[PDB]
Amino acid sequence: LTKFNEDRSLQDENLSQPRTRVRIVDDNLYNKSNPFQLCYKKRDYGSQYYHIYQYRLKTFRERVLKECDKRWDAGFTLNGQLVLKKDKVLDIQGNQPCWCVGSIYCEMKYKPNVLDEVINDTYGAPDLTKSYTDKEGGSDEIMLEDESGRVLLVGDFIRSTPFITGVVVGILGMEAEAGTFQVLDICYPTPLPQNPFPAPTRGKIALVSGLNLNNTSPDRLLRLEILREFLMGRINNKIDDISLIGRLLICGNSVDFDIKSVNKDELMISLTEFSKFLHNILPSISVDIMPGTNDPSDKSLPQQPFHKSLFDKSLESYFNGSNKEILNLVTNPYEFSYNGVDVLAVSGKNINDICKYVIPSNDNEGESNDFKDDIEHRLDLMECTMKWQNIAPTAPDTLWCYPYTDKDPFVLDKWPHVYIVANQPYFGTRVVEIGGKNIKIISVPEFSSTGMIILLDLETLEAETVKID
Amino acid sequence: LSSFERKKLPTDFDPSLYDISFQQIDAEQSVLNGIKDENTSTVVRFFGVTSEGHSVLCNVTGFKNYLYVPAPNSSDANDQEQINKFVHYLNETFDHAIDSIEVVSKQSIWGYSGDTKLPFWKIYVTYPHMVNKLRTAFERGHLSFNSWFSNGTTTYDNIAYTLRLMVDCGIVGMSWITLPKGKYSMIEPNNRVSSCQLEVSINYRNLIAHPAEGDWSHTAPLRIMSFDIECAGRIGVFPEPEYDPVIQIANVVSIAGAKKPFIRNVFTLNTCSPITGSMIFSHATEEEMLSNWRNFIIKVDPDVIIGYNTTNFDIPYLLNRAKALKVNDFPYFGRLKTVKQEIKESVFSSKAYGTRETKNVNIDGRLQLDLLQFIQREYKLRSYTLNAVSAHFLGEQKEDVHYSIISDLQNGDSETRRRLAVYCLKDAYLPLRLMEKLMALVNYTEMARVTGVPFSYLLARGQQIKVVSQLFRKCLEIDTVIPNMQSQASDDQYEGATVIEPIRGYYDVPIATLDFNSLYPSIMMAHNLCYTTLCNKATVERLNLKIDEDYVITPNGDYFVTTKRRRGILPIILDELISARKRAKKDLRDEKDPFKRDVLNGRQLALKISANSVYGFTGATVGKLPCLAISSSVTAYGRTMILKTKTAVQEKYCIKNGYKHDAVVVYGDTDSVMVKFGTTDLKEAMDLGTEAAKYVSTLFKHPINLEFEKAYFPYLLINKKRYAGLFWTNPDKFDKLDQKGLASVRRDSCSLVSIVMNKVLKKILIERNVDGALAFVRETINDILHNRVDISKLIISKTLAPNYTNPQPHAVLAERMKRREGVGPNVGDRVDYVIIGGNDKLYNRAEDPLFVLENNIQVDSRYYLTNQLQNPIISIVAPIIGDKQANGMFVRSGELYIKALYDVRDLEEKYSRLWTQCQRCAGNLHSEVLCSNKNCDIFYMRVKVKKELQEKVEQLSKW
Amino acid sequence: SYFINEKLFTEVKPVLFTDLIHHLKIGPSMAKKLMFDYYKQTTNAKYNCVVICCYKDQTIKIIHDLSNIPQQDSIIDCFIYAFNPMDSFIPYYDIIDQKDCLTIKNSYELK
DNA sequence: TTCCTCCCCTAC
DNA sequence: ATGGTAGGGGAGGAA
Ligand SMILES: Nc1ccn([C@H]2C[C@H](O)[C@@H](COP(=O)(O)OP(=O)(O)OP(=O)(O)O)O2)c(=O)n1
Ligand code: SF4
Ligand SMILES: [Ca+2]
Ligand SMILES: [Ca+2]
Ligand SMILES: [Ca+2]
Ligand SMILES: [Ca+2]
Ligand SMILES: [Ca+2]
Known part of the structure; x- marks a missing residue:
């Protein structure tokens, strides 16, 4: 009432x-x-979008290394061929464990491309494109760029964590087919005050x-x-x-x-x-x-x-x-x-x-x-x-x-x-x-x-x- | 390296017990040191590869080149002793060279004089070069013997020695040869002259030369080697061999018809870090690099050294560089051991191909298929740079490293050199992908097997050589000779075909289209037109022929004889050439891939230029065997067929005969008639066009055939040879939008006009909203006037010409580029330019786009709007709206702050998209991206948007 | 006092309960009471009622559905919001003269 | 300011 | 050495 x-x-x-x-x-x-x-x-606005990535890598290398000196340490004894060492992302070969740091970069097919829009004369359209990933196609690739190199990643971890582009986290894996990794462990940077x-x-x-x-x-x-x-x-x-x-x-x-x-x-x-x-x-x-x-x-x-x-x-x-x-x-x-x-x-x-x-x-x-x-x-x-x-x-x-x-x-x-x-x-x-x-x-x-x-x-x-x- | 060298020869190999059967890819005259066979020493060397992959160098020994002359009209000419004294006199005069004089009964190819065969004299000579001197002597009259040839005579069968052997033996280019078991001899390892595995010698009577049809139509496992070089040139100066070294040389050796190459290399000048999937032979000095590359080629023995611009730039650069570096043993990398490769600049001019100067290099035994030439012949594109053709065919725009950064990359470290190496690997794998997609080898193999010329002629000579070869083979079959006729320096022209006056306008009625299948060839085959059927009135009175039964008078007045009397050979040549086109069209009919159906369409459209060039042969005053009585007698018969179709369909499909509307032929060009049946339905217009094709084809003689080609539901007939409409073949869906000639399909118009015209026509014809079309037109005119069209859309391209009288913009520009940079475009290269603003004359005002994008010079907008975009658009919109409107179309702080803030919000969203697409393109997220792929859309755009965003933010700073 | 002709009826723009505070200088904990007694007795013509409802979990909802929601408990206060005898919707707001605030003075002088 | 050559390109 | 002719349209120069 x-x-x-x-x-x-x-x-x-x-x-x-x-x-x-x-x-x-x-x-x-x-x-x-x-x-x-x-x-x-x-x-x-003259410069290019590469000072950003260079600075990110340059500043996150120390933040990752301060953790990687203790975990995956120089005497770490992973199943065999211990960790051999750091390297430069391209300078890797063999099936021995290893760990480097690199600015992950995803590559999806539905990520809108401006060149394709220009060549199709469809530039300026509504940009709905609700999501980028291709789940029902599995074609999404997760590369690991560094100063000189581009190593594809595959395994089980990339199905656990997000692995978003632009982020710099040290990875550890086994080179499988001379181009890819088999990720085994991920190192996030040092704690921040x-x-x-x-x-x-x-x-x-x-x-x-x-x-x-x-x-x-x-x-x-x-x-x-x-x-x-x-x-x-x-x-x-x-x-x-x-x-x-x-x-x-x-x-x-x-x-x-x-x-x-x-x-x-x-x-x-x-x-x-x-x-x-x-x-x-x-x-x-x-x-x-x-x-x-x-x-x-x-x-x-x-x-x-x-x-x-x-x-x-x-x-x-x-x-x-x-x-x-x-x-x-x-x-x-x-x-x-x-x-x-x-x-x-x-x-x-x-x-x-x-x-x-x-x-x-x-x-x-x-x-x-x-x-x-x-x-x-x-x-x-x-x-x-x-x-x-x-x-x-x-x-x-x-x-x-x-x-x-x-x-x-x-x-x-x-x-x-x-x-x-x-x-x-x-x-x-x-x-x-x-x-x-x-x-x-x-x-x-x-x-x-x-x-x-x-x-x-x-x-x-x-x-x-x-x-x- | 255990994969380089070919399959090893079978151990139990001897000249007996075996039948070497191989496909001949090349053939060149040579002399064979050893015993003269059949009184001659010269031989023709047929390089090739057998079915298992072994090389061959069959030397075809024993063939003597001959010269034909009519038996002199005298009594003693039938006295053997006279002939022997004659050959004796000739040996006295011509260096003991004339072998013998056989008396053969032949006939000439010029005219039907009767079934009687004159006696001819086959004059054999020991070495084939003697025939030229003998022919000159016979033609001038220097021979003086019983007053036989004192006046002068006409010689016959003037063809090169190689083609003479290939014609007599029966060997079409790229065919199969079987050296019978035990009939051939092997060259001993001491007297070998080549690098091939099997080096034999056979008499020309013995070898079996199969026709390229049936079991012998396959292709041997050729070894295509693509390659590329990159030179480290001084700053600002184009690479000159004398001073600028070669630093890397890629290699993508592969087998024909394979999925992936089986070799990759990069010969680098210094140490290079490893690449995955490609060996890296890193040398220390340039001399060692060149010598090892030569040894590499010799060991691989490729068959087809393909590339992109290798004929003009790569191989000449390598050769001049090795010459400048005192590398004396380098330039010998043909299939023969001790023949030097040299550059011989040759110029080829043709109406359909244009003048262009080439630097041919004689790599003996190996084909060459520089893809630049293949594309410049097969495809009409705005530009032919590697970037542009890759973007066109392969559909991929990829980074193109900067020129001046090459020196830094080379003089950096092994990582930078690996970067150079992967650039070279991409550049060298590109031509091989292009060759596999475009199907260069397959199409050219079909062409060389159908016509008969060697593969090397397909890319070095025009259509006359193909017609000559087919003609010679047919005459040889039919006991005939071709008279050597000195060229009649020129003429004016003969009569062409009729282009019916157009009833200009825009038609919403369906427009059927009736055209003839291979008109001029069908006329030639139908009315028996040929050289050996030509006749004159006197001959008809002499032989007492009957009219319409033994001869026909063509609408040009010239006489020819029916097939009852003689069967001309041009009917047979055309029959083969348009029966191979049928089986090339019976493939794209059964082809699904959309890009495969525009390559299988470039194969049926090359056997229809090769059948319409049999006519052009008879029509070409300059060039051998010109008969302007078979060529000006098909243009008539082509002018009385549209005049008869336009009079039959226009007067059968009329109201009197029981139809709904009077038909009207609104147009028609040389075979077609764009009949407008008067009905609005499309399934009924097609159903009537198909009936008309049948009825009209009923009126002509077989094989002349008029078939319902297409239909146009909306039709826009601008002018004579210019129109547009929708292309309907089935009454339920349109196929595409045809634009026959309009300034959009031209290549001398900026891309802006092409895009605008395509969108305008799309709206008007498909979308049917004229108002939306005009609104877009006004939107463009604002863009041009406010400098909002990108230079990529304002680039004009014209073909440079050898010589000029009235100065042209691109010609003055090419001179200015040569003066600025030190090298400019050559004759035959399309020059790209945009028209800058200024006061002086137009030709003085045209600049290279990269100069506009480096000096910010103001692109003239009034010129573009007035000259380029105005007249095409006006012409295509005037039929719809009338001419008047068409000509008319071309003649507080807060709210202010909302602007220049929703403009920067549109520029800083394009700036980032472009300058991050460049990073996603180069793949280099972490270091600078210097691109020079000036055939990329985003090129010329990123810098414009940067220069605009900087200014817009500077302006927004004030508020 | 209660000048209810131009305050409700000829007030043809929908009358908010804050307009009472701004005009009669009355307080909120009194303006709601004035609106209350008004619609209780003073009303003589058609007038639409809109009432806010604040709960223990602090939910503020007004549509009130005219029937109920878990009101059987959890309702702290229920103040009669604006009236709209014009019955449609959509008042309009503007700059309002301040210096009549008993809610709270923010912290600072305007300088 | 109206024809009248070059000059490029396309259509048949 | 080099297949053919018909024809539109742009630039400019002279009468
Ligand atoms: N490059 C060309 C194209 C055409 N023609 C002449 C000969 C043709 O018989 C006639 C008809 O021109 P088309 O373009 O229609 O070629 P066709 O009609 O002969 O081939 P098809 O009917 O199969 O399409 O024009 C020519 O001489 N040279
Ligand atoms: S400019 Fe950008 S899009 Fe164009 S080729 Fe270079 S990297 Fe690719
Ligand atoms: Ca190159
Ligand atoms: Ca036709
Ligand atoms: Ca046609
Ligand atoms: Ca047809
Ligand atoms: Ca004209």
Whole structure:
């Protein structure tokens, strides 16, 4: 009986305060240096996509060798012909065990090729191509490139782990047919340091991704408004559970429109509506907007932050200098530092492309050891991406990048306590621990298909979800 | 190395008990040191390989070259003592060379004078070169003996010695010869002159020469050796043999009709790290490398040294390099031990093949099948570089190492040298794959067996030699001689065939197409046209022939006799040549592979140029045996057959005869008639075209046959010899889109026009939305004007010519390239250029694309739009929409920031795709990729997109 | 007080419960009560009701299906959200004047 | 500004 | 030495 439950829910507290309260102050690390930040000037697009691979190999060789000196040691006694030694990937012969390091490179038939599209005059088509691998054909080959050589791999391990291109992990196998390996063991790089975070007066963070605003209104705008109202505490008891949420983090895909048809009309009304929402919510919460893949920002992965011009005049007071604490506008994969808890966030394209590698396409039979459907395998992919020190393995090859020279920001230097990936279809979390260091992998879902916004605690790191409908 | 050398000879081998049976691939005149056989010492050496794989050098000894002259008209000519005194006088005059003078009864090939045979004098000579001097003397009149040949005479049967032996014995090129058991003698190891395993000598009367039909049609296990070299040239200067060494030499020796080669090598100038699957003979000095390569060839004994540009670049470079390095024993690697290989530059000019200068090298005993020549003859392509032909036929664009980086790779380390070695291995395995796909050996073997010329003539001489060989064989069969006729320096031209006036327009009615099968050959075979059937009015009055029963007057007025009187030989030659085309077309009929059906279609389309060249032979004033009374008498009979078809179908399929519509012949070119039956149905238009073909073929004499070729449901008749339509053969699905002549199938038009015209025609004819077609046209005109078409689509190609009067753009460009780089295109090479912008004349304004992509010079866009793209598009869209519209077609900060940000978001997604496809292509993920495969689509594009993205980001920096 | 002609009926744009806070300066924990008593007694004409529902697991859903879901427990509060007597859907939002907030002041001055 | 040669290429 | 002729269309030069 709908009316009587309303009558019961008559709450009539009636003060709640005049007396506006204050959120608990959790401040990002002041802008010092963001490895993912490139001004549009000084971008020298002349170089090629080979300094990236050279730097990855050059930096991962030490990280793999520091582990390979102990495991597979110079006196290791594998069944026979012990390990003979290191080598240069091509300088290998015989059936003796051996181990080298090389940047794996997959070769699938469904990986879209631009030369074929040009020669077929079909360049510029929709790029649906849901998955790359060829499961029902087995034609996928997993090579192991190095400085000089290209050794194909075959065996049982390449059916256990993902083996995504661009990653550099030392392999150990037996040369079978003078061209291939028979993989026997895989060495992941050395463990990477973290920062220490002290145990102590509170904190939370509201994570949200995939707003996807547009002219069509299938509850999207209404869900966004309900979101800001719930973040205002106007939907529940006022304080002590919403008074401390501290900061919001929009994690990409905020404004979705049809580039193919609209001709830039709705891309303005969506931004005006978004700016309305920001002006309504900013006096109450600080906000950090992070560009997605479908947003007014670059398509190269180190996407630079949103421009001040995209936003309505209303927010100009926020964009004034010395107001980064209110609005942030950070680059796409960003390394926040909220009260010491180093949280690394992505828009979620890297894991999407990794799954494009591993997951099959429309097959037209069910594997348990493999055939990642989509439940936990995405968290396993993020686990690997935290093992494989770089956070975008297939960077130059399938999710395009600025052709860096002498440095790659994607390869990690220190692990973050939290690793938030965005726009994932499913919400999940795992407290992964590798090499004595543990991190927390949160996978925020889309706010369009679902309604979840995650509230991550910054003292227990036990994130909880709240579903909006 | 136990796989190189051929199968060892059987131990129990002796001249008796055995029958050496082998396939002769080559034959050349030579002198045989030893006892003269049948008073002659010269021999013809038939190199070959037997069925088991053993070499042979059969010396065919005992053949004496002869000269035919008519018996002089006198009383003493029948006195034997007079003939003996005559041969005595000749020996006095011509170095004791004339052997004898047989009296044989022959007839001439010119005209039907009657069934009586004149007496001729067969003058044998000891060495075959004497016949030239004897013929000159006979023709001028220097002989003075009883006033016999004092005036001058006409000699007969002027053909080379090798072909004379091959004609008399009955040996077609690439056929089988059986030296009978015990009739042949073996050359003793002391007097051997070759490297072959079996080196024998037989009398020409003894050997059995099988025809290439039946049990003897197979092919022996030939050994094809492909190869390639790479030279380390000084910076900026093309490799010159005198100063720039050869550093590597690949090798892919293989057996004909095999899946994979059984040898791979790379002879490198320095140490080279091992490659899997290919030995690596790494030498220390260039002299040792060249000598070991020679020893390698001698040990392998390949039969067919194929390559790509080996005739012009590789082998001449090797020979001049060995000469410059004082390697004196290198240039002897033919099947004969002590014959030096030398370069003899020869020029071949023809209307259908164009002038091109070749540097022939005489590798004795071994064929040569440089694939560049094979493709330049068989296929019309925009360019013939290795990259482009590989991309066309094999379908693969692969990296092409930079030229200047070769020196660095060589002077680096063993790893870099392995990189060079794998490049050479790819370059050398390419021609062999091309040869296996294109079926060069099989097609050329069929050609040399059908016509009769040796395999070496197929790629070094035109069609006249094939007609000459077939003619000589048939005359020999029928006791006839060919009179040596001095060339009638020139003429103007004779009459061609009629091209019916077109009823131009765009037709939505189905357009049947009725054409004759092998028109001119069928006319020749039908009305008995031939040399030995020619006649004149006087002869008819003398012999008292009857009309339409013993002779026919052709529509050109010339007389010929029916088959009752004589059976001309050109009917028989054509019968064989168009009965082999039937059995070559009975193969692609039964062929599934789509790429095999455009090679089996290049074999039926080469036996139809070889049967239409029998006509061209009679029609060629320059060149022996020109008879402009059989050739200007088929053009008539070809002009009274369309004039009769266009008058029969147009007046049978009419309303009076009980049909629905009046038929209309809207076009027709030399045999065809694009009849428009007047019905909209297609299964009924085809059903009527097939009935018309039958009825009309009923009107002509066998074998003339008019068959319903195709149909065009939509038809676009632009002009005379230019049109387009859909190609329907069955009434349920169209096969393809034909474009007969339009600027899209031309090769002197940029690829932009081809693409635009193909898409426009596709829309208009298949999709039937004219408005969508015009919208795409306007979209292109914006691209050209805003510099958004890639140079790959603006490259024009023309064939350089030997001499010019009115300067041409590509000619001035070729001169300028020669002056800039030190080497430019040669006569006969297609030159590629794009038209840059400027003020001076057009010919002064044309540049090599790689110069445009290295200096950023502004491609003239107004010129392209106006000259290249305008007139073709206007011509093909005017029939649909009328001429007027067609000519008309060619005559706040925030929103601003959304632009130049959704433009960079489109350029930085193409930049990465292109410059990572280059990495996926070269395979080299970890080091620099320097490519120069300028026939690659992405070439010229990656640099454009880079230069655009840099500028767009520089511009976006400001906001 | 309750100026319910231009607040509900002639308010023809769908009236959000936050408009009460922004106009009458009332609090949320009182604006819900005002809307409550209004639809309880004051109503005289057709008016569509839209109610939010917050659960123990913090789920916020509004469609409320008019029949039930596990409400038999787990319901903390159930506040009457906006009314839409125009009955179709789709309000529209804009810049709103602040300085009337009893929810929370963010942390910082705007400078 | 209208013919009238070269010049390239194709169609039969 | 070298198969044939018919014909379109582009560039340019002279009258
Ligand atoms: N390279 C050529 C092509 C054709 N013709 C002449 C002789 C042909 O008899 C006549 C017909 O031209 P086609 O292109 O139609 O060739 P055919 O019709 O003779 O062969 P087919 O009918 O089998 O297609 O043109 C020629 O002389 N030289
Ligand atoms: S430019 Fe790129 S695509 Fe073209 S051949 Fe070179 S590597 Fe291949
Ligand atoms: Ca080469
Ligand atoms: Ca025909
Ligand atoms: Ca035809
Ligand atoms: Ca036909
Ligand atoms: Ca003309």
